[PDB]
Nucleic acid binder design. Structure first.
Lengths: 51, 116, 51, 52, 135, 49, 209
RNA sequence: AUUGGAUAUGCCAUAUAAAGCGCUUUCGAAGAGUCGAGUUGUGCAGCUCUAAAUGGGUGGUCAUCUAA
RNA sequence: UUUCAAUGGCCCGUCCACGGACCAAGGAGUCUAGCAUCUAUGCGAGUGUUUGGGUGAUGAAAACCCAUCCGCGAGGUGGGAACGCCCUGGCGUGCACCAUC
RNA sequence: ACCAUCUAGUAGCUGGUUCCUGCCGAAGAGCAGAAACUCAGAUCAGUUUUAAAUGAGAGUU
RNA sequence: UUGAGAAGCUCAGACGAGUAGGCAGGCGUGGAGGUUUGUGACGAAGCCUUGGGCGUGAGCCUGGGUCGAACAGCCUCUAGU
């Protein structure tokens, strides 16, 4: 299943391999992230319609 | 003094191998002997049926297994227990009958002296 | 609650076959990271040797 | 399906076992919030981040 | 367990809290404010309720429309001491396996608090019952 | 004037007589309820299986 | 067909649609549960539809599949669609509701077009009354509370728009709005009753039977 | 290379024997300075006395065991 | 950074006294059983697999499974959350809880 | 007298007891918080007038 | 208007001593699981440094010198921290 909101809970607040913890901001090393930042809108895993 | 159970799974394995060793020795025949069905001795448990120790001498006489040949085919004999009611007798006489139904006893070599 | 009904099956050469398996109901079970983390924390302790 | 069973039918390889039931039905909450059922009765929203 | 959020770490209860935070503030309903408040409560503050209680509470005057969905922020347990279960419609956090089977097989239907929200987003025609806190 | 101290030791046994009768009974009553409270398996499920 | 309609390959799914025309055009009575099973396959044929250009051609194809069905079970075909869509609507996710909104819009117009087609052979009021009866024990049933209101708001929004499209010139006198009036008059869910009139675009010009 | 318990087979086999279970107009032995009692020290031990044969022990007249 | 200038600046801990020559390293609420509350989790008139048995070909002290037990458990009145219908308020329904017969 | 265990003998006592920031905060039954409820349609006050003014939302198990 | 890590973003106002005592959030160390297509003989760790930087702080990052074989961030686990 692709609950897309259960996914973000699991990745957004528990563990993502793509997350760099930062003093001011988290980042993604995910290649498909548009902004390179860890947040709900720019997560490619958690947004099933992504560009 | 504290008894620590770090060998709980090492005991479990050793007992399995002792069963495996016991079979390897007498593998065509069961790893355990047969037991009677007896009723526990109290007002709290007398409605249960549990395994007993061995079959009584009245039970073996009625089934047809003499007390000498009983042990040789893995039928324990409890001389202490008795049959105060016919239910226990017929419950365990049938148990011996069923066990003998499935028994395949392999013939032994018998001395046959040449002369008379 | 709606999900992909069937799953494809592949051969040795990595080619899709025509047979499909209806998705089992376990894949619709709730995904509980907090529960899994707690049960893992305990299950991960059960082969520890004393010191 | 025999190992884990269903939420209504039992597992065959576990005694009396049923898959856990969930607290919500559809886990997409943004689908619930932004549905025509709920967006048809809500009072009209004020601004997002508001001016000073 | 507090006033601002739940102390549970379950994501699906947080998802329910996320939905009812919206209703609580984008509706005038006092039902959606109560549900959000009761979602922040602890296990002992959400005592279970039973099938027999729910049938008993929604009886006697049951000559009315009785479309009223019964809502509990808690668990609906079973009461096997009663033999015939009426036709009920209950939205609860949890149903036990035998509570859910009885409500369905002999009667109506069982909901979740998100299924209720899509049916009654303002809590209209609802009986928001509670369990006894006698411990 | 009341009973013997042995029967005081026997009153607990009289409770005990019915102790595991009732748990064995309430057990199989739970299995009876389980068979009665069974959800039919929704013949729309086996469309794909 | 049922397993093939929900395949993981669009080519496999499509070939089952073309083969479904012969299956539906049969002149034999189809049981209700047979159409329930079929629509579960057809639901996942559209559930898996990928692009908006494709998922809107598919809705046209599924709606264009109604006149193929035999006349005696054509009402059963549509009533089963609205029942298979009511129970599965809540489980749809936010990114898939807009392809099924178009699917209901295409099936609402199919109902009006089928009434138009049958109005030539037999009197219109019987055809509308038979279709209205389908709506009564379907989406617009008051006895069940499980049916979603998101669909009913959709049908209210599109009811007059699809009616105008089916009869570009002028529509006759019939009980076009009977399912809505009987619902608001007796619905047990106040949210439906209070806001259905606000969304329905009922016109008094053509409603007097 | 050392041996297990089995198997097949050969040769020997003191059987004028030894058993199991049918029956009975026949018999049926059973452990003493011990048990027990009185009194001291830590059930046991010391010291004084010292038995019985459906008896003796231990439990609730009954049941159940059969010590030295 | 060093120094100068102007200004301020009475040795630290401990309970007058007591400890302090300096530096490094070591150095003190721990583990375990019982109980009580609170929170979370699973199930829920039930609940608890791990005494043991089954089983585990990649490590096999794990994980998985479970027979028989056993534990612990086992009507009205007013106010009132919430709801419906109305023309603020009125009417109906009235959970939890508290005084009432 | 000495030596080895018991022994980590006996503690009202002595000396000591190791990172940061924030918030609340005494005493010198009462004083401080936490849950639960009931709440401007409520009661209060280290106050004053008279024989109401003014400030504060008040409480409870 | 893009400003949903809804645990985010945004508006406003008041407030700020503090021993005992209570509450919360953080910094650090040894080891564990996962993770970083992680760092490393083109130099790991450690140490030195009037070199620079960040954080209210616990502390962290870094340049240079020295050195010569291993080490770390992040998510959980644990403690002879």
């Amino acid at each position: 299943m692709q609950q897309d909101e259960v996914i973000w809970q699991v990745v957004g607040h528990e563990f993502c391999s793509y997350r760099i913890k930062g003093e001011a901001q988290n980042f993604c090393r995910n290649e498909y992230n548009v902004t390179g930042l860890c947040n709900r809108q720019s997560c490619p895993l958690a947004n099933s319609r992504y560009a | 003094y504290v008894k620590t159970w770090f060998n709980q799974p090492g005991r479990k394995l050793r007992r399995r191998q002792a069963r495996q060793t016991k079979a390897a020795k007498i593998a065509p025949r069961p790893v355990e002997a047969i037991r009677p069905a007896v009723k526990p001795p109290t007002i709290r448990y007398n409605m249960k049926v549990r395994a007993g120790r061995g079959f009584t001498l009245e039970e073996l006489k009625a089934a047809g297994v003499s007390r000498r040949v009983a042990s040789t085919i893995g039928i324990p004999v409890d001389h202490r227990r008795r049959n105060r009611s016919e239910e226990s007798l017929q419950r365990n006489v049938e148990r011996i009958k069923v066990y003998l139904a499935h028994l395949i006893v392999f013939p032994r070599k018998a001395g046959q002296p040449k002369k008379g | 609650a709606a999900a992909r009904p069937t799953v494809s099956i592949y051969n040795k050469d990595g080619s899709v076959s025509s047979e499909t398996l209806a998705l089992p109901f376990v894949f619709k079970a709730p995904i509980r990271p907090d529960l899994v983390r707690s049960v893992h924390t305990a299950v991960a302790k059960n082969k520890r040797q004393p010191y | 399906d025999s190992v884990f069973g269903s939420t209504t039918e039992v597992a065959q390889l576990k005694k009396n076992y049923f898959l856990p039931e969930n607290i919500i039905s559809n886990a997409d909450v943004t689908r619930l919030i932004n549905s025509d059922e709920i967006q048809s009765i809500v009072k009209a929203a004020g601004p997002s981040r508001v001016k000073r | 367990s507090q006033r601002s959020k739940p102390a549970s770490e379950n994501v699906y209860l947080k998802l329910l809290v996320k939905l009812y935070r919206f209703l609580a503030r984008r509706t005038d309903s006092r039902f959606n404010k109560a549900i959000l408040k009761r979602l922040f409560q602890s296990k002992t503050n959400r005592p279970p309720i039973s099938i027999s209680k729910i049938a008993a509470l929604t009886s006697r005057k049951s000559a009315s429309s009785q479309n009223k969905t019964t809502v509990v922020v808690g668990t609906v347990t079973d009461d096997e001491r009663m033999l015939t279960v009426p036709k009920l419609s209950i939205a609860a956090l949890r149903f036990t396996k035998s509570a859910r089977a009885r409500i369905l097989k002999a009667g109506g239907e069982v909901l979740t608090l998100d299924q209720l929200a899509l049916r009654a987003p303002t809590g209209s025609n609802t009986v928001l019952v509670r369990g006894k806190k006698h411990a | 004037t009341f009973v013997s101290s042995t029967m005081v030791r026997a009153a607990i046994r009289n409770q005990a007589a019915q102790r595991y009768v009732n748990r064995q009974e309430s057990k199989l009553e739970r299995q009876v309820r389980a068979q009665q409270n069974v959800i039919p398996e929704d013949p729309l499920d086996n469309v794909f299986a | 067909f049922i397993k093939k309609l929900a395949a993981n390959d669009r080519k496999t799914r499509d070939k089952a649609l073309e083969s479904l025309q012969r299956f539906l055009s049969q002149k034999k009575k189809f049981e209700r549960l047979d159409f329930l099973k079929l629509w579960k396959g057809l639901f996942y044929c559209m559930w898996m539809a990928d692009k908006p250009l494709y998922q809107q051609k598919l809705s046209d194809n599924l709606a264009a599949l109604v006149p193929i069905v035999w006349i005696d079970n054509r009402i059963l075909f549509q009533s089963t669609f609205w029942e298979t869509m009511g129970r599965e609507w809540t489980g749809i996710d936010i990114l898939r509701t807009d392809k099924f909104y178009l699917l209901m819009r295409r099936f609402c117009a199919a109902a009006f077009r089928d009434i138009q087609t049958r109005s030539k052979t037999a009197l219109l009021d019987k055809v509308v009354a038979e279709y209205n009866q389908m709506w009564m024990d379907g989406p617009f049933n008051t006895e069940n509370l499980a049916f979603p209101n998101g669909i009913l708001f959709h049908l209210a929004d599109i009811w007059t728009e699809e009616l105008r499209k089916v009869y570009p010139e002028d529509v006759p006198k019939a009980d076009w709005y009977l399912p809505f009036d009987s619902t608001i008059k007796s619905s047990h869910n106040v949210v439906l009753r209070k806001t259905l009139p606000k969304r329905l675009d009922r016109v008094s010009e053509y409603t007097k039977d």
